[PDB]
Amino acid sequence: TRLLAISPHLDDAVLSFGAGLAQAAQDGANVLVYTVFAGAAQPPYSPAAQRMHTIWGLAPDDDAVLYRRKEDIAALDHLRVAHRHGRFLDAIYRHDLVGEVADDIRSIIDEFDPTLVVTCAAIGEHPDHEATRDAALFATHEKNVPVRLWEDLPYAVYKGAVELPQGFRLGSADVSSVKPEMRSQKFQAVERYSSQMVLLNGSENNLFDRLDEHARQNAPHGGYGETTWPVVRSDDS
C-alpha cells in the first residue's frame, strides 16, 4: 500500500486520522503526509496573524510556519510516517488557488504513485480545508486514484453533511477500530503540535476527552476509532 494523506494545515491529518496513518505504517504501508498550506510566511503579518502567533507562544513577528513544520515532523515521526511540506500560504497569511493546489497534487501523485489518497471532508467549511479537499478530488479523479475523506477533528465533535463538487458523492461511513495503545500513540503525536494545543484544549482543557467521547459514540465496542468515507462518482457524472 502507498498511502498519500493530504492535510490542509500542520495538524489536521494527525488530529483526524493519526491512528489510521500509524496503523497503516505498522501494517507495512508506505505512508506520506503532504500538507498543502505549509508555505513559508514572513512579516508583515496581519494583526489577526500576529494575534494567532502570540496565542501560540511566539513573538508576533516570529516564523510561525517553521515552528509548526517542526511540530509536524515531530508528530509524524512519532507515527512513523513521512512528511512533505507544501508551498501554499495558510489563509491567515493570504478556483485559481484550487487549480494550483491540484497541479502540485498531480505532481506528487506522479512521483509517489499512491494506491490510495486520504484527505479531509472539510466538515466545518474552513476555506483551506475545502480547497485541499476539492483539489485532491480533482487530481485523484484525473489520475484514477481512489480517495477517502476523513471526518475533520475536532470540528466534527460538535457539527457532518458536506457539499462536494458536482460529480462526487460519499459512500457509507466506516468507523475504524483503534487499539488503546494506538489511541495513545495518536494522542501523543497530537501533543507535539504545542502551538495548536492552546486553542484545541480551550477553557475546559479537554481535547482528548472530547475526542474519546466522540469516537465512543460510533466506534466498534465503544472504543476509539476514526470515521472515513469512500468517494465515488455520482450518477450522470
Residues that bind Co ion (CB under 5 A): 8-9, 12
HSE of 176, CA atoms in CB hemisphere, 13 A: 21
Taking residue 127's Cβ as centre, other Cβ atoms within 10 Å add up to: 12
The answer to the question of whether 129 is labelled as a binding residue is yes
Rounded to the nearest whole angstrom, what is the least distance from the CB of residue 28 to Co ion in the complex?
Answer: 29
Instruction: Return d(Cα 163, Cα 135) in angstroms, integer.
Output: 14
Pick 8 or 114: Cβ nearer Co ion: 8
Pick 35 or 50: Cβ nearer Co ion: 35
Pick 131 or 178: Cβ nearer Co ion: 131
Rounded to the nearest whole angstrom, what is the least distance from the CB of residue 191 to Co ion in the complex?
Answer: 17
Pick 66 or 232: Cβ nearer Co ion: 66
The answer to the question of whether 151 is labelled as a binding residue is yes
The answer to the question of whether 126 is labelled as a binding residue is no
Rounded to the nearest whole angstrom, what is the least distance from the CB of residue 15 to Co ion in the complex?
Answer: 8
Q: Which residue is nearest to Co ion (CB)?
A: 9
The answer to the question of whether 9 is labelled as a binding residue is yes
- 3-state secondary structure (DSSP) of residue 199: helix
The answer to the question of whether 12 is labelled as a binding residue is yes
For the chain, state the CA radius of gyration.
Answer: 17
Angle 48-50-55 from CA coordinates, rounded to 5°: 95
DSSP assignment letter at 26: H
Pick 124 or 223: Cβ nearer Co ion: 124
Instruction: Return d(Cα 174, Cα 165) in angstroms, integer.
Output: 21
Rounded to the nearest whole angstrom, what is the least distance from the CB of residue 213 to Co ion in the complex?
Answer: 21
Pick 177 or 194: Cβ nearer Co ion: 194
Rounded to the nearest whole angstrom, what is the least distance from the CB of residue 162 to Co ion in the complex?
Answer: 15
Residue 126 and residue 93 in contact, taking contact as beta carbons nearer than 8 Å: no
Instruction: Return d(Cα 222, Cα 201) in angstroms, integer.
Output: 23
Alpha-carbon dihedral 197, 198, 204, 205, rounded to 10 degrees? 40
Residue 150 and residue 15 in contact, taking contact as beta carbons nearer than 8 Å: no
Rounded to the nearest whole angstrom, what is the least distance from the CB of residue 124 to Co ion in the complex?
Answer: 8
Instruction: Return d(Cα 170, Cα 166) in angstroms, integer.
Output: 12
Instruction: Return d(Cα 74, Cα 77) in angstroms, integer.
Output: 5
The answer to the question of whether 85 is labelled as a binding residue is no
Annotated binding site: 9, 12, 83, 90, 128-129, 151, 214
Annotated binding site for Zn(2+): 9, 12, 83, 90, 128-129, 151, 214
